[PDB]
Amino acid sequence: VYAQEKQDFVQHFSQIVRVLTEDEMGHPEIGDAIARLKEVLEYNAIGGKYNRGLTVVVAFRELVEPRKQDADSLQRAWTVGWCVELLQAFFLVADDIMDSSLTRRGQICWYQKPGVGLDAINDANLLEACIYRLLKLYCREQPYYLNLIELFLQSSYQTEIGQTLDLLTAPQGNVDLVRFTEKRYKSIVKYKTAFYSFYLPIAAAMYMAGIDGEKEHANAKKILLEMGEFFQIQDDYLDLFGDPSVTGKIGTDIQDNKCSWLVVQCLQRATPEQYQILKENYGQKEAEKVARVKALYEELDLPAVFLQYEEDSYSHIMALIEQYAAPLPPAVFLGLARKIY
Amino acid sequence: VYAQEKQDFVQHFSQIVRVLTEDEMGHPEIGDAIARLKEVLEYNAIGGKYNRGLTVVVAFRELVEPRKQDADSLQRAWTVGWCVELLQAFFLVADDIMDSSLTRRGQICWYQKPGVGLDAINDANLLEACIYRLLKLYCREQPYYLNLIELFLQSSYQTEIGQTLDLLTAPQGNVDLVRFTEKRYKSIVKYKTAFYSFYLPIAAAMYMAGIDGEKEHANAKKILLEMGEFFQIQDDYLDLFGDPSVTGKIGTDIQDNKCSWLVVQCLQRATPEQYQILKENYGQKEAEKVARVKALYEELDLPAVFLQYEEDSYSHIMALIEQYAAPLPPAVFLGLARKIY
């Protein structure tokens, strides 16, 4: 469903940019700003995998009757999919500044480019603004208009709450594995990542399908947040015990003092001497000390614990889908599960 | 109208905070984030003059019949007034980071406080999020609900466009008085400042009064943007040729290489040798060189030009009010004019 659909998706981006930079050229006064906007858009919304945005489109096709999927309905689904991707771009640009990252998706972070710097803060906010400009431009007259606006606003707020939680939890310069508990981990994942990465896209498609029922949404959310929790846990696992060539990235959670799932489990599975080592090697830069932590995880059979967790999680999700999918086609959720597992 | 009204306004802030931090305590998981939110709110939304927010309230009383101003209608107007103030707080926190300011309203900028730093970027975004949470919490059922959401979103986007324009225009480290033209100045003022500081508050009150007419709004906007242009021009003037004890602040536009109104006029009123001096003293730190610019302005009789501009501007605004105020009470606009002149 994503294989050949990803094609028309990236293709629609040129129009999105045209619309966002054309309905402003009527004021040549702001011309130079609009040019800057284009550059921000092209640099930051492109180059990912577009999983979230494509999920809006795939889900839309599965929830809407084919005779109702006219050229216009589809263009709107493409636009709302790009809105999710812009929310995404909004978070990353801002997050890379806050974390002092150097690279993202392999290339230099926007704020690290010469002559951008902290101006990237306004750039991030423009990306957020473009979402609602798109919604107005394409969905102003649709019955689900206000529903999508509120959905995107709520997803931003929840992500930002989650980011606050994450920031409070791993203060850069306040190494304290104490607050790295399971309840804090699941709370951070849920707000910072799961709501906008898994619920938002499906939720958007739902409203565009006229499925606005508070109960149906609560049902999808139950399934989707859980999928998002496993997504992140598997991401933490793979960061360390993964294969950089397959995944396409090199792990750094240990050199970043992250509240990883691994370190959370390692903390519940550790003797006072096991902790002493973690409390002295976690957050360092040296490859000698980092590799020292990996060994402690391994010794604690966390890679095994994860595999055990992956089986339990998969069973639970399938039970979740069997219990809350309807009236929606279970294929809506099964497509996502097949991707992340 | 602002004199005794400012009282109930600041008073309502405790409830705003309560509502924004209480309808979240049902999730003790995010408790610590919500506590952080409170601190962000109290530090950053308080301590200004509340002109913009109070304008929503004053305007609401003048546009709505007294028998329709029940306790609930008023609480909503108080809340929408605080929403404007939160938009305000949102911009300042973020702008102080981008400009590397040290202080604001006399005290240390939020991002400069110990243990905040660039995390202030997420804090700013939470402040923006709170606006729409308030609107949902108080106006969800009102006929002007979607109108206010769109108004706040449009005001953010326009402010952000303006900020981009301003950033492109005075690149910190690219002293180029060339781009400091009158058209660029008026464009920056209009987008960055005038729309959200003057149109937004009145516009909000209007919609709450059921005045949603596209023509009436276009009429108010014509008057209000012009008032905003004079507001900023007078602000630039006063920054230099003002009295720090009366105004309550010390000028720094010259030590900041700002695209001020003064420097814009000085550039149109300057011989090649007059410019040579400006191109060498503008943006410096030394009090000897700064004071050197002030002398060049004076010699060019800019203080006179301003006074001449202030009289022309006042006449034009009164003509503007006589021509576009109705169906609105001219007092709505005259209250603002009396304040800024």
Give a structural overview.
- The structure is a homodimer of 341-residue chains.
- Chain A has a single domain, classed as Orthogonal Bundle (Farnesyl Diphosphate Synthase), CATH 1.10.600.
- Chain A has 341 residues and is mainly α.
- A two-stranded antiparallel ribbon of chain A has the order 1-2.
- Chain A has 14 helices and two strands.
- The A-B interface holds A 24, 29-30, 32-34, 36-37, 94, 97-98, 100, 115, 118-119, 121-126, 129, 132-133, 136, 145-146, 149-150, 153, 156-157, 160-165, 167-168, 171, 183-184, 187, 191 and B 24, 29-30, 32-34, 36-37, 94, 97-98, 100, 115, 118-119, 121-126, 129, 132-133, 136, 145-146, 149-150, 153, 156-157, 160-165, 167-168, 171, 183-184, 187, 191.
- Chains A, B: The modification N6-acetyllysine is found at residues 49, 279.
- Chains A, B: It is found in: Cytoplasm.
